[PDB]
């Protein structure tokens, strides 16, 4: 249960090769250690299934790659023999003990509880298929509602372990049904953080942002990644989704973030960005951008998909707030503010502008940047009429279909 999210998190570092060499190597030593102790040999082999002849592969179990910077992934047949020994042993013994508890008769309580004990072993060794079955028998037999919440969650955690986001997706719909039927708050906190991390992994950061603020105030730690990590997820969602005012009020009215200060590199890079952004310092905004990229997105499982998406959107927001405060800027003045040369700026503005979410134009000959973004009645007009075409269209088709049938 508990060691599992540590392993998964470390392993992720070996999956990439865009992370630092010395950070990947310490992490690799750790993983081997728990391969021995916790039997994580099946997940070691799984990483090789996700490459096929992709960087991070050097395995002696199957094919190997010499363009990888990973070289600490190299299997042995000592690893493999040690596995079959341990697997065979543990399973025979532990099942035998569990079987006698089923024999002793009390249907609701004794049998149901015996069925849970299998699912912890199968979770531990990282097999999704066998875990699901044995924990399915537990849910089928009447047990307390809290337990049912625990066990559905346990299944949904194996989907983040392998990183199959869909696996998490399906199962947590079942939590949302049982959350009110159980009506328990202990585990309500946990739910908000799980479904939070689901939203984090996909492209819906609005939902995440509302769930993850709650996570800070009150935290349950079972089957959830370390609390320094939970602060790092909150700051990401807040900056991306919310704008100056909401964002600002949020990180001054969160004591939890402030009492913790910096404590790991990822947390530091995120927090730095924050201050600069609402405080209107753009000199130092830009080093922090580069820093977040390296130490926040790449290490995280759920934000490495968004590595590029993140930098893209963040340059838009910074620019938006600047454009808000100025009628005009000169390109050279706007460049000096960032700490980037004159030519450097023109490229960046010009990728955002035809897409039209920056809503400004650049007189090149005058060297000014003009801002023609409406906030009047003209702006409201643009929003509304676009939605009203959409009402027409929806009625048109559904109309036509019913008249004919």
């Amino acid at each position: 249960r508990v060691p599992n999210y540590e392993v998964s998190e470390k392993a992720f570092l070996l999956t990439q090769s865009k992370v630092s060499i010395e950070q990947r190597k310490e992490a690799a030593e750790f993983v081997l250690a728990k391969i021995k102790e916790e039997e994580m040999a099946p997940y070691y082999k799984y990483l090789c299934e996700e490459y096929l002849v992709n960087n991070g592969q050097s395995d002696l179990e199957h094919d190997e790659k010499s363009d990888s910077l990973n070289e600490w992934i190299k299997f042995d047949q000592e690893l493999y023999n040690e596995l079959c020994k341990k697997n065979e042993s543990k399973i025979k013994e532990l099942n035998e003990k569990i079987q006698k508890l089923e024999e002793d008769d009390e249907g609701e309580l004794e049998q149901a509880q015996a069925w849970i004990n299998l699912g912890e072993y199968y979770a531990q060794i990282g097999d999704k298929d066998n875990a699901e079955k044995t924990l399915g028998k537990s849910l089928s037999k009447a047990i307390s509602t809290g337990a049912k919440i625990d066990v559905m969650l346990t299944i949904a955690r194996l989907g983040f372990f392998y990183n199959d986001q869909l696996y998490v997706k399906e199962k947590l719909e079942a939590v949302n049904s049982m959350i009110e039927k159980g009506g328990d708050w202990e585990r309500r906190n946990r739910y908000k953080t799980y479904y939070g991390i689901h939203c984090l992994a996909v492209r819906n950061f609005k939902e995440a942002a509302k769930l993850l603020v709650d996570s800070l105030a009150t935290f349950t730690s079972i089957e959830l990644t370390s609390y320094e990590s939970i602060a790092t997820y909150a700051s990401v969602t807040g900056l991306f989704t919310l704008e100056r005012t909401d964002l600002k009020s949020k990180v001054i009215d969160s004591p939890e973030l402030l009492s913790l200060i910096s404590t790991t590199a990822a947390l530091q890079s995120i927090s730095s960005l924050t201050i600069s952004l609402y405080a209107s310092d753009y000199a130092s905004y830009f080093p922090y951008l580069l820093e977040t990229y390296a130490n926040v997105l790449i290490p995280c499982k759920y934000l490495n998909r968004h590595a590029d998406f993140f930098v893209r959107e963040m340059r838009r927001k910074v620019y938006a707030q600047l454009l808000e405060s100025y009628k005009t800027l000169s390109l050279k003045s706007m460049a000096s503010a960032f700490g980037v040369s004159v030519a450097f700026l023109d490229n960046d503005l010009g990728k955002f502008i035809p897409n039209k979410q920056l809503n400004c134009v650049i007189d090149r000959v005058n060297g000014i940047v003009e801002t023609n973004r409406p906030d009047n009645k003209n702006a409201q007009y643009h929003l509304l009429v676009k939605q009203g075409d959409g009402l027409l269209t929806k009625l048109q088709k559904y109309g036509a279909a019913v008249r004919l049938t």
Binding site: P255, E256, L258, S259, I261
Partner: protein
């Protein structure tokens, strides 16, 4: 452990230290929560000059 065995005039002092701790970490949530505590502890009156000054 001293909530289970509280009979000490000495825990007014503990409460005050804690409040200072939290103030300088810059959370007011629990800076507030501890100042109330120390004040409750100083209702039964057994405090030195120094203690009330704090």
């Amino acid at each position: 452990e001293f909530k289970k065995l509280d009979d000490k005039p000495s825990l007014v002092d503990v409460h005050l230290l804690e409040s200072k701790v939290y103030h300088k970490l810059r959370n007011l949530a629990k800076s507030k929560a501890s100042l109330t505590a120390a004040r409750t502890a100083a209702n039964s009156i057994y405090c030195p000059t120094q203690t009330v000054a704090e």
